[PDB]
Ligand SMILES: NC(=O)C1=CN([C@@H]2O[C@H](COP(=O)(O)OP(=O)(O)OC[C@H]3O[C@@H](n4cnc5c(N)ncnc54)[C@H](OP(=O)(O)O)[C@@H]3O)[C@@H](O)[C@H]2O)C=CC1
Ligand SMILES: NC(=O)C1=CN([C@@H]2O[C@H](COP(=O)(O)OP(=O)(O)OC[C@H]3O[C@@H](n4cnc5c(N)ncnc54)[C@H](OP(=O)(O)O)[C@@H]3O)[C@@H](O)[C@H]2O)C=CC1
């Protein structure tokens with residue numbers, strides 16, 4: 001029914017952790033630069049909690065915030081209240097990026113076409129997790145080692161998976 | 166249609182620069198010795214401008230120069246004038262290396278199977294760039310840190326990517 005490509009953009013550790021105390025458990029500027037390059041010129045779909053943690057509209061992209069709050073407004077951002085409203089706002093979009101967090105990943109899980117997942121080889125303490133996924137019917141179309149140095153202190157890989165018809 | 170493996174051999178910076186004033190923007194003997202090791206015993210496909218910058222046939226490899234000039238000749242080198250002519254000269258080769266520069270990288274881009282790309286972590290001034298590449302259906306099959314020392318003054322990594330069928 002929807003015409004835009006629904007993509008997931010996420011980074012997670014060995015146990016699927018994505019967050020701790022409403023922020024990122026790791027600081028990886030190189031990973032963030034890859035995120036910015038990939039998502040540039042495409043809508044970002046983020047949960048209300050996810051947005052407030054970031055604190056600011058991310059440049060060069062349509063920021064769409066998902067909340068049940070019927071009176072929620074933020075300057076320089078669009079607000080949706082359901083999967084369908086998001087699909088309406090993004091009717092004509094080429095590809096959208098579901099950007100998190102867990103509640104929003106859950107919401108859009110039945111609709112994912114493509115998965116951009118960074119895997120981080122470390123066991124972080126966390127409270128927020130990326131939902132399990134049946135990877136049957138999925139093909140890995142890209143993999144590469146991320147940059148490890150003084151500023152990026154963990155081992156990590158970029159993966160991209162596409163669903164088959 | 167063709168049976169030889171078409172490989173790219175290239176070194177570029179953070180902004181895809183490969184050249185400046187018909188020359189290399191950096192001097193990396195260690196990177197050059199990896200190039201010689203990998204390409205040895207395999208044909209080199211070079212654009213006319215790339216060849217003349219080098220100035221001499223590179224030993225142990227078939228040097229094949231790509232030009233539109235029908236009366237162009239160089240001692241100890243073969244001269245092709247098109248993608249297909251290169252394919253004819255290399256019909257029986259196991260693996261050929263597209264060696265640059267930009268115009269020749271463009272020419273053979275639709276045919277690349279394997280990419281040997283050195284990434285140099287520095288922002289050089291340059292005029293010649295390595296073409297953008299959709300890496301969908303490519304996988305990194307090798308990565309390693311290059312040697313940094315007094316003789317090799319930059320941070321750089323060797324990457325190898327293979328196309329998937
Ligand atoms: N490492 C990574 O790749 C990522 C990690 N994160 C991390 O995840 C955490 C945030 O994720 P999480 O706590 O799951 O929160 P979310 O980002 O999923 O936001 C939760 C909010 O989304 C709204 N919401 C949820 N379901 C619906 C619905 N069905 N209809 C309308 N609105 C809905 C609600 O807003 P409301 O209460 O206003 O009604 C809810 O409070 C942070 O720690 C963050 O750092 C986030 C993104 C990526
Ligand atoms: N960093 C790296 O990995 C590398 C860097 N380089 C750098 O790049 C620069 C050279 O690149 P660039 O300027 O693009 O030159 P090229 O090496 O790509 O050579 C261009 C020439 O190739 C010939 N040519 C182009 N298209 C065709 C075609 N379709 N059919 C037949 N012949 C064709 C033409 O020759 P003609 O005019 O004679 O007809 C043209 O002038 C230099 O600065 C060099 O140092 C080069 C290789 C690698």
Ligand SMILES: COc1cc([C@@H](O)C#Cc2c(C)nc(N)nc2N)cc(OC)c1OC
Pocket residue numbers: 009010011022023024031032035046050053054098099100116117118
């Ligand atoms: C709390 O602070 C942030 C939280 C997020 C989060 O929304 C995310 C993510 C995110 C990350 C990190 N990586 C990948 N591969 N996909 C994602 N979707 C982003 C940020 O910068 C942009 C943040 O500022 C520092």
Ligand SMILES: COc1cc([C@@H](O)C#Cc2c(C)nc(N)nc2N)cc(OC)c1OC
Pocket residue numbers: 174175176187188189196197200215218219264265281282283
């Ligand atoms: C004008 O000076 C040169 C220019 C080139 C260029 O053709 C190249 C390259 C090249 C390099 C450096 N690295 C990688 N990974 N791939 C390449 N294709 C080579 C040279 O030595 C052989 C040069 O002499 C010093």
